[PDB]
Amino acid sequence: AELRERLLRAARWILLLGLLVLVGFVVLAYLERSPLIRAFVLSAGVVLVALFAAALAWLYLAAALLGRSPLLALVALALGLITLAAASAAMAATFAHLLLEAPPEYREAMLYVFGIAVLIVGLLLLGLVWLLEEALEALLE
Amino acid sequence: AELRERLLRAARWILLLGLLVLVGFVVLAYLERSPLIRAFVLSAGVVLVALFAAALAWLYLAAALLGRSPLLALVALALGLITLAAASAAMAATFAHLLLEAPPEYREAMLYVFGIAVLIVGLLLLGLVWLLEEALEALLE
Amino acid sequence: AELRERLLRAARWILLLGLLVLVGFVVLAYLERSPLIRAFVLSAGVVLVALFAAALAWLYLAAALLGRSPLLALVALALGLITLAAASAAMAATFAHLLLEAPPEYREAMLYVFGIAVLIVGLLLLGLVWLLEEALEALLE
Amino acid sequence: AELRERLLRAARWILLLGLLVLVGFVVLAYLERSPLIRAFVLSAGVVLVALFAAALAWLYLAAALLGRSPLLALVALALGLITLAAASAAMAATFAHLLLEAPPEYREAMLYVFGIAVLIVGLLLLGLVWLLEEALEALLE
Amino acid sequence: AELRERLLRAARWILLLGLLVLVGFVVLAYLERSPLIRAFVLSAGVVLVALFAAALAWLYLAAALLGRSPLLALVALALGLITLAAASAAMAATFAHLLLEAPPEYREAMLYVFGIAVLIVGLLLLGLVWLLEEALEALLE
Amino acid sequence: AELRERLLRAARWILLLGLLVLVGFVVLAYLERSPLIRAFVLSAGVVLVALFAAALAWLYLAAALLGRSPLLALVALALGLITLAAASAAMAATFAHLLLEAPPEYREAMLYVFGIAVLIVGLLLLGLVWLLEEALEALLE
């Protein structure tokens, strides 16, 4: 019945994980000892908060659509999946570009934060497959 | 009706925060004895005026939608949220590139106005999402 | 009636300012001996002419939508505002990049002409807000 | 009156100007052989042929919509105007970048070809205003 | 009905020329003697295969729309013309950038492959112009 | 009725290849000998996981739109083909840039991986083009 309970629980946990990415990348921006690391970290912080805002947005489009046509919600989740995956890909290319131009002493710690950013927004786009599949099996039957 | 009071009270304070950013980043352009920090500052000025105006545009579409279909406003505000978050990310990414390419003496003061510009254009998203989800609450409860 | 008149009187002056700011950056390009300053000045000429002409296109998109209702104009004008704001901020960001990469001896002329571009931004975006305030009042107050 | 055939009877001369820009820039591609100039010339060749293809595509679309109403012609033609203006401004930006990074001996002749592409832009945008505004008169009649 | 007997024969030779570009550029990738020329050639390979996939998509979108009327195909083919022209112009611009960045010893054969992409572009855009005209002369004239 | 079998069989193999090619690039991300190669590896990883997810999104959009007719899938899958192919082309372009700017000592392993990314999206080029061939056969041939 209320598929929105799953989507909104996912969304508000995604918001809190976005606010933990905020506190985590801001506390790293308070801990870290290079301005080029602080720039990449805080930038990745908001480039990832934008990814949590993307999953928020896609979960709001579904939560509005499933009140009248659930197959339009599934499609909105999928259109958001590819769009948030493009945001992952563009972020990954961007961060590969800064890893090439950045000086060696700030490549090392940055490669991990590139990694963890890529882990968060990669897990997000794959999570949308799991969120829509229960609606997929319920209209592909 | 009721949601428009929140939406448009938010909007015109978002406009005057656009005017305070206009005056604050212009006054920084009158104080700052660096053409490269002046370039960063006025471009952060128009990225933030464009950000406030993105909230103005999507708040005007929400308010004009609320006279006929609140679920259209909810969805339009969500489409505006992700788009404004991408605009935040694009500045926060590109200005992390300028923080690498710039000469050292204009990295230090630039890292602060990178910060304050990112705070202003990022917190704006947390505003827009807190507004739109009242329509999610209203339709589900 | 009144919306198209105000849009079209705005348009005609926006078209004359398109042609005149073009003739201004062309006659500046007749004085300015540096090829890099002429490239910047005439490219500012294009991206500003394109913004003026795009405000014409957004005023014509309103005039075409007005045959359905004023609310079709209000929304399409606002979608033109945010698109113009993005195009403006991307222009200012581009110029804030060229002002770093350009040799020091040609940074001063950039510091005015990216400035006059930012003045045309500050005018153009609020120029749509001012008629959105009217269309909001007429539809929704 | 003539709109469905008129647009396409400017367009076919815009196709011949597409082919005459093609032959002019391909002849220039051996009149001025130097690799970076030939690259900029043939790039301006296809970035202008893409602009003539844009006007061709806009002039096919705007006419084809006219079976519904004149509002469909004016909206599609104008959405092509702004989109062609943006594509032209992006060209003016990227050309203004190559004009910095290219070595001096290939800046001089390139500044003119940047110029003639920018003239063809300045013609095209005012052309799209002049081809449209009969259907603008149809919305004050 | 009859329009697709042209359009699908065109499409399948566009697919074979996609696979034949996918043999000539793919063979060149192990027949050439520089990794930067391999990068430019095989990347031009997919940038051109994406063009044959674009013309494939535009011809499948006609064939699907044609069950309603030819006027849907004419519009989709024109929408694909300008949209493929942008992707083509972005190719020539982008690879003119790599052709500045490349050292002189790998500019020479690279200039020619930029050339052959510009030939395939010129063919493709004049292609969609010829393909819609038999619908234009019938329904539009 | 039947077509969601062919779609979701292709999809689940595309998801498994998403995770397995992800495990290929994650194993490489702790067995490759340079941070720049690991950055290219992980980015080639998520730019392919995003490509696999693009095909997942197009396969969900087909299988959901199939409740109207297979012609909605043909159109959606084709709209997905062009943008997925363009995403591989933009990857191959930006990776031709990193492969030019990176020093020789990190060009060698990178010369395979840009190729293996180019090959692997060929599964998605074919995997959509084959189902476009069947969906075109199904309408009238």
**What DSSP letter does each residue of B23-77 carry, written as one string?**
HHHHHHHHH---HHHHHHHHHHHHHHHHHHHHHHHHHHHHHHHHTT-HHHHHHHH
Rounded Cα gap, residues B34 and F75, in angstroms: 54
Residue B66 sits at the chain A interface (C-beta within 8 Å):
no
Picking from D124, D129, D127, D97, the residue whose alpha carbon sits closest to that of residue D110 is D97
Q: Note the Cα C103 to chain centre separation in Å.
A: 28
Solved with? cryo-EM
Rounded Cα gap, residues A110 and C71, in angstroms: 49
Chain B, nearest residue to C138 by Cα: B64
Length of chain A equals: 141
Length of chain F equals: 141
Of F92, F129, F140, the CB nearest to E43: F92
Residue B50 sits at the chain C interface (C-beta within 8 Å):
yes
Residue E56 sits at the chain D interface (C-beta within 8 Å):
no
* Residue of F8, F36, F43 to mutate for A, most A C-beta atoms under 10 A: F43
Picking from F59, F89, F63, F64, the residue whose alpha carbon sits closest to that of residue F77 is F59
Subunits adjacent to chain A (3 or more Cβ pairs under 8 Å) = B, F
Q: Which two tokens stand for residue C98?
A: 């060229």
SS3 state of residue A66: coil
Count of CB atoms within 10 A of residue C115's CB?
Answer: 17
Q: Which two tokens stand for residue C111?
A: 């510091």
Chain F, nearest residue to E87 by Cα: F86
Burial of F9 (0-12, 13-18, 19+ CB in 10 A): exposed
Subunits adjacent to chain C (3 or more Cβ pairs under 8 Å) = B, D
| Residues 6 or more apart in contact with residue C101 via CB below 8 angstroms | B101, D100, D101
Asked if F78 contacts F9 with a C-beta cutoff of 8 angstroms, the reply is no
- How far off is chain D from E60, nearest CA to CA, in Å? 18
Strand ranges (E), E32-107 = none
Rounded Cα gap, residues B32 and C108, in angstroms: 15
The residue type at E87: A
Count of CB atoms within 10 A of residue A7's CB?
Answer: 23
* Residue of E47, E124, E125, E139 to mutate for D, most D C-beta atoms under 10 A: E125
Q: Which two tokens stand for residue D128?
A: 């799209």
Asked if F64 contacts A139 with a C-beta cutoff of 8 angstroms, the reply is yes
CB-hemisphere CA count at 13 Å for B23? 5
User: What angle is formed at CA C26 by the lines to CA C21 and CA C31, rounded to 5 degrees?
Assistant: 125
SS3 state of residue F141: coil
Residue C102 sits at the chain D interface (C-beta within 8 Å):
yes
Burial of E18 (0-12, 13-18, 19+ CB in 10 A): buried
Rounded Cα gap, residues C79 and C57, in angstroms: 12
Burial of A34 (0-12, 13-18, 19+ CB in 10 A): middle
Subunits adjacent to chain B (3 or more Cβ pairs under 8 Å) = A, C
CA distances from A63 to A59, A69, A121, B139 (A): 6, 10, 21, 9
Size of interface C-D (CB pairs under 8 A): 107
Asked if E102 contacts E36 with a C-beta cutoff of 8 angstroms, the reply is yes
Chain A, nearest residue to F53 by Cα: A82
Q: Which two tokens stand for residue F28?
A: 């490489």
Rounded Cα gap, residues A73 and A95, in angstroms: 32
Would you call C63 and D136 a contact, using CB atoms and an 8 Å cutoff? yes
SS3 state of residue E68: coil
Rounded Cα gap, residues D63 and D72, in angstroms: 9
Q: Which two tokens stand for residue A105?
A: 């002493």
Residues E101, E107, E111, E112: is their CA dihedral positive or negative? negative
Q: Which two tokens stand for residue A4?
A: 């929105």
Strand ranges (E), D30-97 = none
SS3 state of residue A102: coil
Q: Which two tokens stand for residue C31?
A: 């004085």
Q: Which two tokens stand for residue B94?
A: 């590109």
Q: Please give the torsion angle defined by the CA atoms of residues C87, C90, C91 and C92, in that order, rounded to the nearest 10 degrees.
A: 130
Burial of A2 (0-12, 13-18, 19+ CB in 10 A): exposed
Rounded Cα gap, residues E30 and E24, in angstroms: 10
Of B74, B89, B101, the CB nearest to A50: B89
Rounded Cα gap, residues B87 and B81, in angstroms: 10
Residues C47, D101, D114, F95: is their CA dihedral positive or negative? negative
Chain D, nearest residue to E77 by Cα: D57
Chain F, nearest residue to A91 by Cα: F43
Question: Max CA-CA distance within chain B?
Answer: 56
Q: Please give the torsion angle defined by the CA atoms of residues A27, A29, A33 and A36, in that order, rounded to the nearest 10 degrees.
A: 160
How many H-runs (helices) and E-runs (strands) does chain B carry?
4, 0
What are φ and ψ of residue A66, in 5° steps? -70, -10
Q: Where are the alpha helices (DSSP H) in chain E?
A: 3-31, 35-65, 70-101, 108-135
**What is the stated resolution of the deposited model, in angstroms?**
3.8
Count of CB atoms within 10 A of residue E127's CB?
Answer: 16
CA distances from E130 to B65, E73, E126, E127, E138 (A): 43, 13, 6, 5, 14
Picking from E140, E117, E96, E104, the residue whose alpha carbon sits closest to that of residue E41 is E117
Picking from E118, E75, F59, E108, the residue whose alpha carbon sits closest to that of residue A136 is F59
Residue B75 sits at the chain C interface (C-beta within 8 Å):
no
Name the DSSP class of E140: I
Size of interface D-E (CB pairs under 8 A): 94
Name the DSSP class of C34: -
Residues of D in contact with C60 (CB under 8 A): 74-75, 78, 81, 132, 136
Rounded Cα gap, residues B44 and C27, in angstroms: 30
Q: Which two tokens stand for residue D65?
A: 């919509």
Q: Which two tokens stand for residue C126?
A: 């609020």
Q: Where are the alpha helices (DSSP H) in chain C?
A: 2-31, 35-65, 70-101, 107-140
Would you call D46 and E82 a contact, using CB atoms and an 8 Å cutoff? no
Asked if D42 contacts E121 with a C-beta cutoff of 8 angstroms, the reply is no
Residues F68, F73, F74, F79: is their CA dihedral positive or negative? positive
Stated as kind and residue range, the H or E segment containing E24 is helix E3-31
CB-hemisphere CA count at 13 Å for A8? 12
Count of CB atoms within 10 A of residue B74's CB?
Answer: 26
Q: Which two tokens stand for residue D74?
A: 């004016």
Rounded Cα gap, residues E78 and E88, in angstroms: 15
Picking from D45, D60, F92, D114, the residue whose alpha carbon sits closest to that of residue E121 is D45
Residues of B in contact with C75 (CB under 8 A): 60-61, 64
SS3 state of residue F68: coil
Would you call E111 and D35 a contact, using CB atoms and an 8 Å cutoff? yes
CA distances from E86 to C37, C44, D86, E31 (A): 28, 22, 11, 31
Residue D105 sits at the chain C interface (C-beta within 8 Å):
no
Count of CB atoms within 10 A of residue E12's CB?
Answer: 13
Rounded Cα gap, residues B26 and B32, in angstroms: 10
- How far off is chain B from A139, nearest CA to CA, in Å? 22
Picking from D66, D52, D69, D70, the residue whose alpha carbon sits closest to that of residue D128 is D52
Burial of C111 (0-12, 13-18, 19+ CB in 10 A): middle
Q: Which two tokens stand for residue B106?
A: 């204009």
Tell which phi-psi region holds residue A20, choosing left (phi > 0), alpha (psi between -120 and 50) or beta: alpha
Tell which phi-psi region holds residue D68, choosing left (phi > 0), alpha (psi between -120 and 50) or beta: alpha
Count of CB atoms within 10 A of residue E125's CB?
Answer: 25
SS3 state of residue F33: coil
Asked if A66 contacts F41 with a C-beta cutoff of 8 angstroms, the reply is no
Q: Which two tokens stand for residue C14?
A: 């926006």
Residue found under tokens 């000539």:
E24
Asked if F92 contacts F114 with a C-beta cutoff of 8 angstroms, the reply is yes
| Residues 6 or more apart in contact with residue F113 via CB below 8 angstroms | F40, F41, F44
Rounded Cα gap, residues A49 and A84, in angstroms: 12
Residue B94 sits at the chain C interface (C-beta within 8 Å):
yes
Count of CB atoms within 10 A of residue C31's CB?
Answer: 9
Would you call F60 and A136 a contact, using CB atoms and an 8 Å cutoff? yes
Rounded Cα gap, residues F69 and C119, in angstroms: 52
Rounded Cα gap, residues C2 and C13, in angstroms: 17
